[PDB]
């Protein structure tokens, strides 16, 4: 399909399958959920009745005592020692098929174009590594929360946006569904656009 520009007014040709396909609600949600789960690290643990410091001696005899039968000071129904099902460090990452990941990414890109949240422009660069310059460049464009995607990563643009929370700078290869969804506006360079079709295929 045809992607219009706002600065050079130059036509761009892009496959409609990767930019004009329908929006799959179910597929995108699964990929987004999978991405969040993969961000976890699951560094937690408790002590079961075997790992609690203590001794296995019976608190009192089985019979004769007027109280409830007890077996150990570390039973889960006892104060200061227990946890019936203690947690262990686990991996929460889940598998997502390559095609499913690509399909969700294609679905997300198409809808950004449909909601005009995606803006394609020519090369986006800053002459000097100054956050002030980048802020001015984004101010006249009426953009405050933007994800800058460029074909080639340059330290000059990387340093300029480092201290800008609402602004992110990324490469085409390092593109994730969550970032595209989260950011209000996405700006893609002409080079950045081309690499997307090649990797998306």
């Amino acid at each position: 399909m045809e992607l219009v520009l706002k600065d050079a007014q130059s036509a761009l040709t892009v496959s409609e399958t990767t930019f004009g396909r329908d929006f799959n609600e179910a597929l995108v949600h699964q990929v987004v959920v999978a991405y969040a789960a993969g961000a976890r690290q699951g560094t937690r643990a408790q002590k079961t009745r075997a790992e609690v410091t203590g001794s296995g001696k019976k608190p009192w005899r089985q019979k004769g005592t007027g109280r409830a039968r007890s077996g150990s000071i570390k039973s889960p129904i006892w104060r200061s020692g227990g946890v019936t099902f203690a947690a262990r460090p686990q991996d929460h990452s889940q598998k997502v098929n390559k095609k499913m990941y690509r399909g969700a990414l294609k679905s997300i890109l198409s809808e950004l174009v449909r909601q005009d949240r995606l803006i394609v422009v020519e090369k986006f660069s800053v002459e000097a590594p100054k956050t002030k310059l980048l802020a001015q460049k984004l101010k006249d464009m009426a953009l405050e929360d933007v994800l800058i995607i460029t074909g080639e990563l340059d330290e000059n643009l990387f340093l300029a946006a480092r201290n800008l929370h609402k602004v992110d700078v990324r490469d085409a290869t390092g593109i994730d569904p969550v970032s595209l969804i989260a950011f209000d506006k996405v700006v893609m360079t002409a080079d950045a656009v081309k690499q997307v079709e090649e990797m998306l295929a």
């Binding site: 608190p59 009192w60 004769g64 005592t65 007027g66």
Partner: peptide, 17 residues
Amino acid sequence: NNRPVYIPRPRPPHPRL
């Protein structure tokens, strides 16, 4: 507050009705 009881008791004549 536990105070374990170590008091054995005498064996009475079992009912053995």
